């Protein structure tokens, strides 16, 4: 109840874009925006008051409404030099908050016709975050429509979006849903700081046309808290009993001071936990332990929060076990940092010995090093952001030492010579294959207590209803967590009487960011489970019955911000709100927008015959850099290009990918279901253009433009179409064909090529189109790369049937 | 003392890690020395084993790849000074070995990475080989999926071993007659031919010569672990297994679960190695090797 | 040396060792040649030689773990484990050249098959991939000099020339039978009759001449 002004001092943009009849600027809108609706009053928003000197009304009613008061750098005079507001109000906390935010965020872009001010507007859209990426400048405009979790995914557009009502009576009625619960509870810093991510994701914070606005409200509203709730945990340790004095003479105290701390933590060994399963559990436990490793992951930042009460915007980055974190550069937090890193690690030696080890590096951070200085030319603005790389490359070389000495010597010799429970190796598990637990041999296989626990998850966790959960404290039932916690899965429909208890350590919900009510502090998760077990996607397929694998990682993601801004304009654009934006969109593309491209797809060149025949695959983990999907081979190989055709519509030619798709039988083991498809994104990532794909082998390595055009829609859309009408014709003829493409380096194979070609026509078929049907297949034969596409086109039809 | 360079012809092999369907290129010597205390009972009389149960006067390396004429010594775990791009930051962990020279150029971010990773696929392929399982009772037979490693046609595994030349002469007494190595060796796997050649003297044991890079998954004593850890760039593995051998003829049980250090790890100070014993319950001692050997 | 018996297994009809082209052969992933795996030459002979030495005297053997001594002397087990005395060379093709220089082009032909359902006389075709019926494979197998490890404290029982000649008459009837039977799959239909040739005993000097005559008589 002392950090409340971190968020709500920017509410003056969209209310006059919704025409609720206020007047004045963003300080005047929001200081009466929470006067019209929050106090349950039925008055008109066109005549609200300015300033009251009431003695009996305290902070909870006055300075909650007066937590904004004055936030911009031009109206600092009234709240101080007329005595309108004293130091014990959080508006001063919110004044320096947006000042250090927009002083490090708001900069006009490099246009021709400058000196443009940002004022009251009701038409302007946000533009693409990917404009400044690359040596080209795009003009694509993020249309500020509704984005609270509907089908489809929302894409950038080039035209100027028409200003309507329907999406904007929907935004304010969403603000009618969760901005009426603004009361003295937990819903301050956990509820509001997630459900406004999607609503305010395409809405800009400015008006100026001498700039191209890429930062939204939320990537600035996060930075109002992440620099505002940061400094409050820097505040009383630095010696402040009056907030005016830190902005009356020491408003330029951060010339060379360090008041911020940039940290990380990574769980090194996420992938080599999920991909060691030797037996049964290949079908079920492959998804559950990845669901386990992502579920304590969000809990793993949450104990670095629960010790101090920071924001969940302090994770500016999140996804894949990794979470960049900004802290105050005090020493109470730095001490309790290493309390967090070591003790959770100290818990890990009871359950997972040498797999998971988390570790935190640190960079003490100034404030002038982010902002572009006055009078920074070419040889002067270039040296400002070299240190902005120097807080990342010399943050990676903080955890390029912790990942080499991971355990103390007093710790390992506890475990270096032990057999716990003192028993025999007749009881030894199958999945996690450990010995120390009494192996409770259920379901006719020796499975440990952990492997017993994950079998209890998949009764309800991969079903399509029980995607809610609960983290309680250190109890017996559930999945065990560091820092005194269990982890469970349930529903919160009729079990809210177990969700209104104070024995809940952490609370979450599923993908659907549920406004109106609260089903949990939800995050972005994987709910695409068509059927539960892996065997149900080889039990239906007319054609071959092969479980198809898919793994795909976006290339070069270490150069996403270190060298992804500094090639166009000499890198003045390197700032925290411009770099927490694409890492706020990747938390929707690879975590929620993949549910659109899977539940109702578009491209169907193998299956066809229905536009919204759902993809029968199942994604292992929707998160971050890497997507892992396994289903039947049929739906994956179309969707594996189709998702990339929802990827080249966002980066629009700057970010590259390489995927991997293989086909495997049902009972195939996992430990070589990820060591061979680790060559299929291991060979087409070794492409000179790096934007390709590799199917079924390292010798098929094809570009993304060479695959959907040359292979399928040219060559596969040649073969099975002449006997489209005779759909059941001899594929016992077509496996003669690709013998010849292996012996193509012999001379008479030209003769045998045309020989077998006109061994198909005659008087028993329609031969109006046969001379060209072999001639297309005759010209493809001679070229030493035309048939390279052809072999895959032949393989698609024989594996389709 | 001399040392011994051991050139093999390992075509297919299977050193598992956590089961059978995977494999490893390296044999951490607690797997190799345990063979020398089970492929000596099959030649000696349990006197050759008892000659070398717990002496550890012999320092031997592990079974690391070689591609052609150059030893593929391991990628050390030292902090690279990658002042270059982040792709070759990531390209280091996709590289397990490198030739005998480039390590000093490697450690400061001053080296190539798309030739060493380009000789990864010159070592050999991580293959698989499907097989069909038991007629369990009278029912339908299952498969069992077992995966291996396959070398290139000009590779194998190397070894450097030194110590007392009498107990070194009994290694080459054993190895000229040690059969198919690896795990699943009663089938065609792990078979090879051991040959002797003169060592590279560029790879001397620098136990205190300011190059504290080992060539063996090893361990010091439990107390002296507190001394060799302040600047240790180390990784921990499991060296577990099963035991179920003659003179121990009961239900198969396990070795004791140990966690030795890495095999190319670089430390702060010199250390000693000793034979840890992993017998938990039962008659004859079974023991892990942990006696390292160093490198320039 | 050890007693490492060589061999030259010649296919005489076509052989199809499943390795599951829809149903391929065992493809050596280096040279894309045909091989014979070490466990389709071991795990077949156990299903024969435990029904020739066993199943003479009305022995059932419902698992491979209760088989007789000179089975489990040679093949080993999980309960008693005398010794694993037979380690087989996983073997692959000898002459790809003279097979192809004398006319072949593919090294793995395709055989066609049907399946007439006897309800409506309908043909259901099927394609089967064999090896070329002249595909001469080389072969070896390793018997050891075998200092036996005694699980009892009857220390260091090395077998001399007494017990070892009984197991030479085991593999004799191991591979006399395999010349008169299968090696591969989709059986009772002519797939993959083999013919072992040029067998030799290979390593004392007095012992060796009788070691031939078990295996020469197959």
Provide the fold topology.
This is part of a larger assembly, with chains A (801 residues), B (296 residues) and C (218 residues).
Chain A: H1 26-36, H2 62-65, H3 78-81, H4 90-105, E1 126-127, E2 141-142, H5 168-178, H6 192-199, H7 218-226, H8 228-238, H9 245-248, E3 260-263, E4 266-267, H10 271-274, H11 285-306, E5 325-327, H12 332-351, E6 358-359, E7 362-365, H13 378-381, H14 386-390, H15 393-396, H16 409-415, H17 449-457, E8 468-472, E9 479-481, E10 485-490, E11 504-506, E12 547-554, H18 576-579, H19 582-589, H20 594-599, E13 618-623, E14 626-632, H21 633-642, E15 657-664, H22 677-683, E16 692-693, E17 702-703, H23 704-722, H24 731-740, H25 749-757, H26 771-782, H27 786-800
Antiparallel strand pairs in A: 1-2, 3-5, 3-7, 4-6, 8-10, 8-11, 9-10, 12-14, 12-15, 13-14, 16-17
Chain B: E1 3-7, E2 12-13, H1 29-36, H2 48-51, E3 58-60, E4 64-67, E5 70-71, E6 73-74, H3 87-93, E7 97-98, H4 103-106, H5 120-123, E8 124-125, E9 128-132, E10 143-147, E11 149-151, E12 155-158, E13 160-163, H6 165-169, H7 171-175, E14 195-197, E15 213-214, E16 242-243, E17 253-254, E18 276-277, E19 287-288, E20 294-295
Antiparallel strand pairs in B: 1-13, 1-14, 2-11, 3-13, 4-5, 4-12, 6-7, 8-11, 9-10, 15-20, 16-17, 18-19
Chain C: E1 3-11, E2 35-36, H1 39-49, H2 69-72, E3 87-88, E4 91-92, H3 97-101, E5 110-113, E6 126-129, E7 139-143, H4 164-179, E8 194-197, H5 208-216
Antiparallel strand pairs in C: 1-7, 1-8, 2-4, 3-7, 5-6
Helix pairs in contact in C: 1-4, 4-5
């Amino acid at each position: 109840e002392t950090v409340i002004g971190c968020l709500l001092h920017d509410i003056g943009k969209p209310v006059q874009r919704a025409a609720l009849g206020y007047r004045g600027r963003h300080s005047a809108i929001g200081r009466a925006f929470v006067k019209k609706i929050w106090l349950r009053d039925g008055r008109n928003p066109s005549e609200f008051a300015d300033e009251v000197y009431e003695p009996d009304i305290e902070v909870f009613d006055r300075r909650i409404l007066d937590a904004i008061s004055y936030h911009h750098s031009s109206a600092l005079r009234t709240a101080a030099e007329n005595g309108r507001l004293a130091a014990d109000a959080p508006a001063y906390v919110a004044y320096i908050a947006d000042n250090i935010a927009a002083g490090t965020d708001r900069r006009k872009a490099d246009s021709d016709d400058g000196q443009g001010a940002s004022t009251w507007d009701s038409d302007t859209p946000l533009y693409s975050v990917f404009n400044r990426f690359g040596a080209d400048t795009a003009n694509l405009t993020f249309a500020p429509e509704m984005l609270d979790d509907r089908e489809p995914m929302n894409i950038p557009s080039a035209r100027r979006i028409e200003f309507d009502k329907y999406r904007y009576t929907e935004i304010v009625n969403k603000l009618e849903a969760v901005l009426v619960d603004l009361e003295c509870s937990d819903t301050y810093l956990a509820s509001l700081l997630n459900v406004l991510e999607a609503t305010l994701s395409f809405v800009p914070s400015s008006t100026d046309a001498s700039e191209v606005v890429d930062v939204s409200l939320f990537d600035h509203l996060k930075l109002t808290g992440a620099l505002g709730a940061c400094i409050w945990h820097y505040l009383q340790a630095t010696g402040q009993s009056d907030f005016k004095s830190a902005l009356f003479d020491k408003q330029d105290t951060f010339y060379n001071e360090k008041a911020f701390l940039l940290t990380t933590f990574d769980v090194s060994g996420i992938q080599d936990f999920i991909y060691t399963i030797h037996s049964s559990g290949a079908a079920k436990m492959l998804r559950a332990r990845s669901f386990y490793l992502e579920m304590l992951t969000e809990h793993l930042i949450d104990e670095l929060l629960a010790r101090v009460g920071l924001s969940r915007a302090n994770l500016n980055y999140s996804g894949g076990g990794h979470a960049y974190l900004l802290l105050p550069n005090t020493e109470f937090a730095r001490n309790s940092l290493e309390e967090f890193e070591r003790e959770a690690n100290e818990w890990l030696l009871e359950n997972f010995a040498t797999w998971l080890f988390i570790a935190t590096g640190s960079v003490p951070l100034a404030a002038n090093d982010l902002m572009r200085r006055p009078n920074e030319s070419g040889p002067q603005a270039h040296d400002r952001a070299l240190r902005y790389s120097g807080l990342y490359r010399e943050l990676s070389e903080q955890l390029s030492a912790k990942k080499l000495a991971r355990y103390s010597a007093d710790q390992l010799r506890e475990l270096n010579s032990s057999d716990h429970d003192g028993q025999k190796g007749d009881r030894e598990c199958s999945v996690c294959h450990t010995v120390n637990r009494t192996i409770k041999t259920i379901n006719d296989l020796l499975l440990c207590s952990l492997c017993q626990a994950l079998t209890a998850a998949s009764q309800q966790i991969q079903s399509e209803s029980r995607r809610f959960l609960l983290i309680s404290e250190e109890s017996s039932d559930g999945l065990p967590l560091p820092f005194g916690a269990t982890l469970t899965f349930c529903s919160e429909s009729g079990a809210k009487q177990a969700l209104q208890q104070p024995q809940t350590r952490r609370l979450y919900a599923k993908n659907k960011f549920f406004a109106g009510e609260s089903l949990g502090t939800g995050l972005w998760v994987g709910d695409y489970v068509a059927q539960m077990e892996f065997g149900d996607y080889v039990k239906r397929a007319s054609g071959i019955a092969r479980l198809g694998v898919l793994r795909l990682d976006v290339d070069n993601l270490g150069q996403a911000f270190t060298h992804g801004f500094m090639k166009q304009g000499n890198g003045k654009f390197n700032t925290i709100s411009r770099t927490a934006a694409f890492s706020r969109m990747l938390s929707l593309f690879f975590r929620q927008h993949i549910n659109y491209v899977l539940k109702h797809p578009k491209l169907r060149p193998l299956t066809g015959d229905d536009p919204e025949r759902s993809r029968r695959a199942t994604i292992i983990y929707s998160g971050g850099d890497d997507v892992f999907v396994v289903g039947a081979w049929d739906d994956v190989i179309e969707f594996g290009i189709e998702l990339r055709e929802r990827f080249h519509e966002f980066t629009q030619g700057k970010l590259t990918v390489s995927a991997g798709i293989g086909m495997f039988p049902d009972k195939y083991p996992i430990s070589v279901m990820a060591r061979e498809v680790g060559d299929l994104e291991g060979a087409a990532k070794s492409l000179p253009g790096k934007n390709g794909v590799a199917l079924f082998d390292p010798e098929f390595t094809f570009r993304w433009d060479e695959l959907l055009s040359k292979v399928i829609e040219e060559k596969y859309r040649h073969i099975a179409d002449y006997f489209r009408c005779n759909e059941e014709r001899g594929m016992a003829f077509i496996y003669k064909l690709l013998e010849l493409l292996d012996q193509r380096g012999d001379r008479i194979t030209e003769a045998r090529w045309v020989y077998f070609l006109m061994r198909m026509r005659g008087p028993t078929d329609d031969t109006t189109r046969f001379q060209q049907f072999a001639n297309r297949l005759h010209q493809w034969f001679q070229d030493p790369s035309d048939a390279k596409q052809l072999k895959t086109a032949l393989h698609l039809y024989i594996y389709r049937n | 003392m001399n040392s011994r360079l051991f050139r093999f012809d390992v075509v297919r092999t299977h050193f598992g890690d956590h089961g059978l369907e995977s494999s490893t290129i390296g044999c951490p010597a607690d797997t190799l020395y345990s063979a020398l205390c089970v492929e000596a009972l099959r030649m000696g009389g349990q006197q050759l084993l008892d000659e070398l149960v717990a002496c550890s006067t012999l320092r031997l390396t592990d079974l690391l790849p070689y591609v052609g004429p150059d030893y593929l010594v391991p990628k050390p775990l030292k902090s690279v000074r990658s002042d270059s791009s982040s792709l070759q930051k990531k390209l280091a962990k996709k590289i397990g070995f490198l030739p005998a020279a480039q390590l000093g150029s490697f450690l400061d971010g001053t080296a190539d990475l798309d030739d060493l990773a380009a000789r990864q696929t010159k070592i050999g392929v991580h293959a698989v080989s499907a097989k069909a399982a038991i007629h369990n009772g009278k029912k339908d037979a299952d498969p069992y999926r077992v995966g291996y490693f396959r070398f290139e046609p000009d590779a194998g595994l190397w070894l450097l071993a030194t110590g007392s030349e009498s107990e070194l002469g009994l290694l080459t007494r054993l190895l000229k007659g040690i059969s198919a190595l690896g795990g699943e060796r009663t089938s065609g796997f792990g078979a090879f031919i051991p040959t002797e050649s003169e060592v590279p003297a560029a790879l001397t044991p620098t136990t205190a010569a300011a190059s504290l890079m080992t060539l063996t998954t090893s361990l010091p004593t439990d107390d002296e672990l507190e001394q060799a850890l302040a600047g240790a760039t180390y990784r921990l593995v499991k060296r577990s297994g099963f035991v179920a051998s003659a003179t121990y003829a009961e239900t198969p049980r396990r070795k004791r679960d140990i966690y030795k250090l890495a095999a190319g790890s670089v430390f702060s100070r010199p250390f000693q190695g000793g034979i840890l014993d992993v017998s938990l319950g039962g008659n004859h001692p079974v023991y892990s090797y942990a006696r390292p050997l160093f490198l320039a | 040396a050890k007693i490492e018996i060589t061999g030259t297994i010649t296919v005489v009809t076509g052989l199809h060792i499943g390795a599951g082209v829809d149903k391929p052969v065992v493809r050596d992933p280096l040279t894309k040649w045909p091989m014979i795996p070490g466990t389709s030459l071991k795990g077949k002979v156990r299903t024969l030689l435990s029904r020739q030495y066993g199943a003479d005297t009305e022995t059932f053997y419902r698992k491979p773990n209760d088989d007789p001594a000179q089975i489990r002397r040679l093949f080993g087990d999980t309960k008693e484990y005398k010794t694993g005395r037979l380690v087989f060379r996983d073997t692959k093709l000898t002459n790809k050249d003279d097979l192809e220089a004398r006319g072949a082009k593919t090294l793995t032909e395709v055989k066609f098959e049907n399946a007439i359902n006897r309800v409506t006389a309908k043909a259901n075709p099927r394609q089967m991939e064999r090896v070329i019926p002249g595909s001469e494979f080389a072969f070896s197998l390793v018997y050891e000099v075998s200092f036996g490890t005694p699980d009892e404290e009857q220390k260091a029982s090395l077998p001399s020339s007494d017990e070892i000649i009984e197991d030479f008459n085991a593999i004799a009837r191991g591979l006399k039978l395999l010349e008169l039977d299968y090696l591969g799959g989709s059986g009772t239909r002519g797939y993959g009759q083999v013919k072992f040739s040029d067998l030799k005993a290979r390593a004392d000097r007095s012992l060796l001449e009788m070691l031939n005559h078990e295996l020469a008589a197959v």
